[PDB]
């Protein structure tokens, strides 16, 4: 906690039971969990103290942005302006390294629904819009069923479980739009407009879907929120480092004996969960040289800095790493890395639409440059030029897809430069 000791976490500290599907994801199972607890009484017809409960919660963005969600949601204490206000929930779950939002929807829709109700009330929202993947059809039906169970019970619909605050959710789906993983792209998806994100002289808070003001939040934040509004949010604020208050899902993945998702205290050492929840990588931890924090977006972490870093994102920032929804992809040393990062940047090129020029062209270009690198044909100096490209991508691109498009190879330069040159020399020797 306050001490260097970490890896500790009580099961009842978890907001999320039935994380793994046991004990009935059905609404009856939510009742066994007593999830509706004081949910009607939370609706005292005035945000503030719940909104302040979240401000005091220490809670920040679970979209990987890490942005203080209490302040983010503070924005819609504003008068409705006569245009109906909505809350849009981000359920894209297209991001790599991220299976976290999948099993929760598969096994615990209800806490999220209560989150739509509480947070939707906090916004004064007319409704509760929720995106779904087109890859996510069957799951959309599961959630539609649980939501129907919420209707029949009257827990939603008109007045919604008493209190008299009208509340209708609206399930929404897309098709192949990974960029709608970006929030404003999804807000654009709602109008039937293509999911190419807006520039923001006005923020989404100022203007939302259909011109009527809206708001957005990641599934994790909005799902934890009702429990923040019930169980003390200060109790949530107690875990981890102060700025890193609360808990985060840890999706250990890739080459390891037991890859898994484990919600956990924000600031456990990164090696610990590998040695614990992950069961350790095959061939032992010693093989590790490259394991990436974040959803295949943030820069790579070498084992030396890896031993020191705590899972909370600030420790990552000192490791020069973003939050990235704290997804974790382990990468064993025996495999080549450059092919992997090239495959990743390829993943960006397939998915970046291409509205503003610098990122479209920047990725379309940097990809081919990576092909030249991986083939080994490339001259050693060329890689440095790629760095220049990165510099022209970052603060210029209208959206952060380009940022994560740029970073991993920046890390591959910064650490694996000698490795790169070593690879090039072998191609040099063929003649």
């Amino acid at each position: 906690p306050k001490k260097t000791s970490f890896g500790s976490l009580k099961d009842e500290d978890r907001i999320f039971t039935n994380l793994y599907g046991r004990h009935d994801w059905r609404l009856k199972g939510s009742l066994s969990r007593g999830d509706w607890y004081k949910t009607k009484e939370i609706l005292l017809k005035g945000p503030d103290w719940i909104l302040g409960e979240i401000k005091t919660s220490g809670l920040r963005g679970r979209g990987g942005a890490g942005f203080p969600t209490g302040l983010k949601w503070s924005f819609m204490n504003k008068p409705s302006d006569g245009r109906p206000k909505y809350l849009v929930v981000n359920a894209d779950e297209g991001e790599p390294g991220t299976c976290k939002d999948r099993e929760i929807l598969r096994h615990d829709p209800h806490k999220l629904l209560e989150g739509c109700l509480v947070g939707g009330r906090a916004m004064g929202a007319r409704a509760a819009y929720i995106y779904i993947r087109g890859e996510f059809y069957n799951e959309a039906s599961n959630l539609q069923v649980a939501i129907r169970e919420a209707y029949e019970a009257g827990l939603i619909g008109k007045n919604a479980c008493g209190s008299g605050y009208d509340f209708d959710v609206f399930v929404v789906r897309g098709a192949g739009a990974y960029i709608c993983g970006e929030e404003t792209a999804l807000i654009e998806s709602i109008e039937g407009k293509q999911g190419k994100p807006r520039l923001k002289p006005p923020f989404p808070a100022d203007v939302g879907v259909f011109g009527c003001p809206t708001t957005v939040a990641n599934v994790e934040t909005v799902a934890v929120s009702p429990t923040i509004c019930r169980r003390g949010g200060t109790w949530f604020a107690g875990f981890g480092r102060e700025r890193n208050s609360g808990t985060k899902l840890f999706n250990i993945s890739g080459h390891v004996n037991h890859p898994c998702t484990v919600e956990e205290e924000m600031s456990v050492p990164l090696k610990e969960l590998i040695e614990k929840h992950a069961g350790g990588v095959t061939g032992g931890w010693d093989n590790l040289l490259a394991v990436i924090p974040g959803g295949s977006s943030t820069p790579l972490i070498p084992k030396s800095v890896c031993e020191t870093v705590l899972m909370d994102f600030d420790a990552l920032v000192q490791a020069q790493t973003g939050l990235g929804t704290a997804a974790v992809i382990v990468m064993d040393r025996s495999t080549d890395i450059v092919k992997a990062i090239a495959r990743l940047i390829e993943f960006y090129k397939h998915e970046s639409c291409g509205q503003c020029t610098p990122c479209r062209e920047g990725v379309d270009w940097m990809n081919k440059v990576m092909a030249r690198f991986v083939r080994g044909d490339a001259r050693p100096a060329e890689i440095d030029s790629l760095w220049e490209i990165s510099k022209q991508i970052e603060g210029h691109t209208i959206c952060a897809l380009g940022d994560g498009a740029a970073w991993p190879v920046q890390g591959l330069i910064r650490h694996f430069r000698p490795e790169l040159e070593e690879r090039m020399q072998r191609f040099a020797q063929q003649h």
Binding site: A381, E382, D384, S385, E388
Partner: protein, 55 residues
């Protein structure tokens, strides 16, 4: 080009002329020469080339 005539010529000359051939004979230089390749140019480095400095 006869040698006695060379002697009498250089005689009147006050100078050897054979020592500095006046009419350009065999030596000249070859017309057909192997390709120049040319200097690469100082600023064709790719790592940096911002106009802000070279300007």
């Amino acid at each position: 080009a006869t040698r006695l005539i060379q002697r009498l010529r250089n005689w009147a000359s006050g100078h050897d002329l054979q020592g500095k051939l006046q009419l350009r004979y065999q030596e000249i230089s070859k017309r057909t020469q192997p390709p120049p390749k040319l200097p690469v140019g100082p600023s064709h480095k790719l790592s940096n080339n911002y106009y802000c400095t070279r300007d």
